[PDB]
């Protein structure tokens, strides 16, 4: 978990008027995203076996279910979105650097 | 003494047990709940982020 | 003079835009990931309870 703390009026100070709304939308997303993170814990509670080992009289159903579950690996998706924003940040850094030198 | 009687001579109550278990299923779901579940995994949407 | 000095600190602050985007990225990622974890946890719990119920 790597989250960068942020101001927000400072954010508002650096939005060109042509694209306020999307930025604001972005902003909105953040907040609801944060809520959606606090809306559920990190890991689900793993289903025990003994409670089902001694109650599910079905043959092998609990067994093979638990096994295929342990044999299940959820696809943890990769971003492929951070590198491009990093590069855009780099270009913006170059631009503001030359601007501030000239100023 | 029911090893010989799979229901021990009920001779009825099937006409209601059918509906009871049908409703129990159709409220629990509609798939083959006796098999292992399959899973499709969607992925989020995105957009242009840089200055247009 | 100071107005240019003001413009200096302002552009200096510009880096907030990018990290906020980053923040939403890592956030939404774990969201869908954890959502998947609870989807799979719920669905197996459903079949498990279904059989023990009937």
Curated annotation (Swiss-Prot), chain A:
Sequence positions bearing N6-succinyllysine: 73, 80, 90
Modification N6-acetyllysine occurs at: 27, 58, 67, 73, 80, 90
Subcellular location: Mitochondrion; Mitochondrion inner membrane
One of the GO biological process terms: proton motive force-driven ATP synthesis
Main localization (coarse): mitochondrion
Keywords, sorted A to Z: Acetylation, CF(0), Hydrogen ion transport, Ion transport, Membrane, Mitochondrion, Mitochondrion inner membrane, Transport
One GO cellular component, as annotated: proton-transporting ATP synthase complex
Assembly and oligomerization: Component of the ATP synthase complex composed at least of ATP5F1A/subunit alpha, ATP5F1B/subunit beta, ATP5MC1/subunit c (homooctomer), MT-ATP6/subunit a, MT-ATP8/subunit 8, ATP5ME/subunit e, ATP5MF/subunit f, ATP5MG/subunit g, ATP5MK/subunit k, ATP5MJ/subunit j, ATP5F1C/subunit gamma, ATP5F1D/subunit delta, ATP5F1E/subunit epsilon, ATP5PF/subunit F6, ATP5PB/subunit b, ATP5PD/subunit d, ATP5PO/subunit OSCP.
Protein name: ATP synthase peripheral stalk subunit d, mitochondrial
Residues of the full protein shown: 6 to 108 of 161
Swiss-Prot record, chain B:
Residue positions where Phosphoserine is found in the record: 11
Annotated localization: Mitochondrion; Mitochondrion inner membrane
Residue numbers bearing the N6-succinyllysine modification: 40, 45
Modified residue annotations for N6-acetyllysine: 25, 40, 45, 51
Assembly description: Component of the ATP synthase complex composed at least of ATP5F1A/subunit alpha, ATP5F1B/subunit beta, ATP5MC1/subunit c (homooctomer), MT-ATP6/subunit a, MT-ATP8/subunit 8, ATP5ME/subunit e, ATP5MF/subunit f, ATP5MG/subunit g, ATP5MK/subunit k, ATP5MJ/subunit j, ATP5F1C/subunit gamma, ATP5F1D/subunit delta, ATP5F1E/subunit epsilon, ATP5PF/subunit F6, ATP5PB/subunit b, ATP5PD/subunit d, ATP5PO/subunit OSCP.
Family: Belongs to the eukaryotic ATPase subunit F6 family.
Record function comment: Subunit F6, of the mitochondrial membrane ATP synthase complex (F(1)F(0) ATP synthase or Complex V) that produces ATP from ADP in the presence of a proton gradient across the membrane which is generated by electron transport complexes of the respiratory chain. ATP synthase complex consist of a soluble F(1) head domain - the catalytic core - and a membrane F(1) domain - the membrane proton channel. These two domains are linked by a central stalk rotating inside the F(1) region and a stationary peripheral stalk.
Protein name (database record): ATP synthase peripheral stalk subunit F6, mitochondrial
Source organism phylogeny: Eukaryota, Metazoa, Chordata, Craniata, Vertebrata
Name of encoding gene: ATP5PF
Residue window of the full protein shown: 55 to 106 of 108
From Swiss-Prot, chain C:
Signal peptide segment: none
Protein name, as recorded: ATP synthase peripheral stalk subunit b, mitochondrial
Source organism, top-level taxon: Eukaryota
Function, in words: Subunit b, of the mitochondrial membrane ATP synthase complex (F(1)F(0) ATP synthase or Complex V) that produces ATP from ADP in the presence of a proton gradient across the membrane which is generated by electron transport complexes of the respiratory chain. ATP synthase complex consist of a soluble F(1) head domain - the catalytic core - and a membrane F(1) domain - the membrane proton channel. These two domains are linked by a central stalk rotating inside the F(1) region and a stationary peripheral stalk.
Residue list for modification N6-acetyllysine: 5, 13
Keywords: Acetylation, CF(0), Hydrogen ion transport, Ion transport, Membrane, Mitochondrion, Mitochondrion inner membrane, Transit peptide, Transport
Main location class: mitochondrion
Annotated source species: Homo sapiens
Keyword Transport: yes
Compartment(s) of residence: Mitochondrion; Mitochondrion inner membrane
GO CC, alphabetical: membrane; mitochondrial inner membrane; mitochondrial matrix; mitochondrion; nucleus; proton-transporting ATP synthase complex
């Amino acid at each position: 978990l790597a989250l960068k703390t942020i101001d927000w009026v400072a954010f508002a100070e650096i939005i060109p008027q042509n694209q306020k709304a999307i930025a604001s939308s972005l902003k909105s997303w953040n907040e609801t995203l944060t809520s959606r993170l606090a809306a559920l814990p990190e890991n689900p509670p793993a289903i025990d076996w003994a409670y089902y080992k001694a109650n599910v009289a079905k043959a092998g159903l609990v067994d093979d279910f638990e096994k295929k579950f342990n044999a299940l690996k959820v696809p943890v998706p990769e971003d492929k979105y951070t590198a491009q924003v990093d590069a855009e940040e780099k270009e913006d850094v170059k631009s503001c650097a030359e601007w501030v030198s000239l100023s | 003494q029911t090893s010989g009687g799979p229901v021990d001579a009920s001779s009825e109550y099937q006409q209601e047990l059918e509906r009871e278990l049908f409703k129990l299923k159709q409220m629990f779901g509609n798939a083959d709940m006796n098999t292992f579940p399959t899973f499709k995994f969607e992925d989020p949407k995105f957009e242009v982020i840089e200055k247009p | 003079i100071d107005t240019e000095k003001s413009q200096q600190a302002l552009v200096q602050k510009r880096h907030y835009l990018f990290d906020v985007q980053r923040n939403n990225i890592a956030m939404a990622l774990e969201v869908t990931y954890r959502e998947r974890l609870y989807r799979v946890y719920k669905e197996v719990k459903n079949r498990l309870d279904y059989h023990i119920s009937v």
